[PDB]
Amino acid sequence: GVSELPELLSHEEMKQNKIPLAYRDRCARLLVPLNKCRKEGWYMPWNCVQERHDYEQCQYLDFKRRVKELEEIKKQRDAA
Amino acid sequence: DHVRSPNVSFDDIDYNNSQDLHNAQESLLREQWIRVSALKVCRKALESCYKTSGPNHYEDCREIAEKYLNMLPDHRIQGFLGYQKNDPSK
Amino acid sequence: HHIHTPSYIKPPTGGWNFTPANWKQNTVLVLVGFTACCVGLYKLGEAGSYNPKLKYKEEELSRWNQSAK
Amino acid sequence: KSFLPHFIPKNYSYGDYPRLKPENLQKRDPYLKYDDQANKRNFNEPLHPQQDDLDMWAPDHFDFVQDSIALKWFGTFFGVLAVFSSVIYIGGLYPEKPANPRNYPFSGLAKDLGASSEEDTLLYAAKIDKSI
Amino acid sequence: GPHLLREDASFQRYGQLRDNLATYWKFNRKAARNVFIFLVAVPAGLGYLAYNYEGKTPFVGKRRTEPIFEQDYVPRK
Amino acid sequence: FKYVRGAIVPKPKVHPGYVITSKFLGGLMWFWIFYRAKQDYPVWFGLKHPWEH
Numbered sequence A: 001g002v003s004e005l006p007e008l009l010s011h012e013e014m015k016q017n018k019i020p021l022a023y024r025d026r027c028a029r030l031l032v033p034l035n036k037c038r039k040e041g042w043y044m045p046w047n048c049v050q051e052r053h054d055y056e057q058c059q060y061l062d063f064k065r066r067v068k069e070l071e072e073i074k075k076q077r078d079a080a
Numbered sequence B: 001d002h003v004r005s006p007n008v009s010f011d012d013i014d015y016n017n018s019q020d021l022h023n024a025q026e027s028l029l030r031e032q033w034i035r036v037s038a039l040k041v042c043r044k045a046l047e048s049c050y051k052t053s054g055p056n057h058y059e060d061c062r063e064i065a066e067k068y069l070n071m072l073p074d075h076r077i078q079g080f081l082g083y084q085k086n087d088p089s090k
Numbered sequence C: 001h002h003i004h005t006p007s008y009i010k011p012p013t014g015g016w017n018f019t020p021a022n023w024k025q026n027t028v029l030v031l032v033g034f035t036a037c038c039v040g041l042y043k044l045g046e047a048g049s050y051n052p053k054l055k056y057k058e059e060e061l062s063r064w065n066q067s068a069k
Numbered sequence D: 001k002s003f004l005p006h007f008i009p010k011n012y013s014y015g016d017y018p019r020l021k022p023e024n025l026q027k028r029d030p031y032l033k034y035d036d037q038a039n040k041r042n043f044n045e046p047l048h049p050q051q052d053d054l055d056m057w058a059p060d061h062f063d064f065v066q067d068s069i070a071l072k073w074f075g076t077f078f079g080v081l082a083v084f085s086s087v088i089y090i091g092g093l094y095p096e097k098p099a100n101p102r103n104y105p106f107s108g109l110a111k112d113l114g115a116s117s118e119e120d121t122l123l124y125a126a127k128i129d130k131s132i
Numbered sequence E: 001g002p003h004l005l006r007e008d009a010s011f012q013r014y015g016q017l018r019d020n021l022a023t024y025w026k027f028n029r030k031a032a033r034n035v036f037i038f039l040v041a042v043p044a045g046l047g048y049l050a051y052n053y054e055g056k057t058p059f060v061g062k063r064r065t066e067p068i069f070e071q072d073y074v075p076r077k
Numbered sequence F: 001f002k003y004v005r006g007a008i009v010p011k012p013k014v015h016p017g018y019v020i021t022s023k024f025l026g027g028l029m030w031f032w033i034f035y036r037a038k039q040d041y042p043v044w045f046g047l048k049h050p051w052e053h
């Protein structure tokens, strides 16, 4: 049930949670519970189903935001 | 026991004194090996910082890595012949 | 079967289907030998090994970076 | 059909050493009996001055086709894979990026990527998320 | 001893020749071409690479002073 | 043993252990393919996102 991007994590909370650098983005807030759930459940496909779906959907919204940006960038490039 | 470096420079001796030139040669060798010892200690800090920090190693170990990359060119054995046989100021 | 010339060719690995008459006796000795210092490998490994990510606290490393700065 | 390997002289002159046509022993009929069956050699057969290049221990000589044909076929193959690459590049037939490539906050994670201060931001920063 | 090796005359003739190639060597145009390549041409090529980059490669702890990745993307359409 | 001339080769008399083991492993694979396909045919083929239950 993720409708829009969550609030961004602070720099310190990223360091505390040892988030991978490539995944320090808008969805890093939803990654902290998932990596916490993944470790407890031995990463088994059936354990943390809901927390995994929520984070996947967040990256989908971050992706669609980047889809919108490129259309915006092209409009400035087309009209300049 | 633990012997010590007889701090003696080529600039303060007469080379015709056989024992004094021997000390300046030894003195320069022992100061370079200590700098090699210090460099290895700094590299030990870099390795422990890298292992513990994980993905935070870029930020956490930044100044340790910077110092190791600066000390590496000159914290190595250079010998005593180079400075014994050359006067930099001339 | 064939002729293996086993009269004088006795390599450490056996030479053409060699199983000595007292193989059961030797097998137990080797199995005892293998097991004995296989535990020795375990005893040494548990004493000598360590976790390189827990040797230094994160607070100790912050001082290192500032001091080396 | 069957041809000799390269760098095999057609003549030589080494004093009284017997002069013989070079025979690549790898091609000998293997269903004949020999005094040296593995090497396909009979005892006291004269050796060419470069027999080490014309026996079993020399590298295997493949002769299904001539070297030029094999080299022509070899170039023909990879030429197609380069024409296929060049047609697409010049025509630009590869698709465009469907989204603006990933960007990151904190000046593109510059601090997390070993940047010291503001002078070295773009040196270490990833792509910067201009939208806060 | 008991002559444990079956001596082969053709082997002996071949081996004796390989040891004595120097007797029949002629400093003709073919030999001169190979002598020039191996003892003049190739040493000169390495000779000019050694002194060209003598002290020109300070590669100990060499730093990166230039970015690797591009900041902005420009489409091709 | 004796060789019978001209006689054709019928279907072999394979030991039941070999046949049943082979059909258990093959049936195990087919079951898994069908079991996974049922719950993932939309996710696999891009016809539905994994979170769109």
Ligand SMILES: CCCCCCCCCCCC(=O)OC[C@H](COP(=O)(O)OCC[N+](C)(C)C)OC(=O)CCCCCCCCCCC
Residues within 6 Å of the ligand: C009, C011, C012, C013, C014, C015, C016
């Ligand atoms: C990391 C380091 C590992 C050290 C220990 C490894 C095991 C040692 C095995 C010794 C016994 C053995 O293989 O040599 C003895 C066997 C004998 O042949 P066979 O099978 O008894 O048959 C006998 C019938 N013949 C007689 C026709 C062979 O081989 C040979 O003479 C074959 C020739 C190759 C020599 C292999 C040497 C391998 C050394 C490895 C180099 C690093």
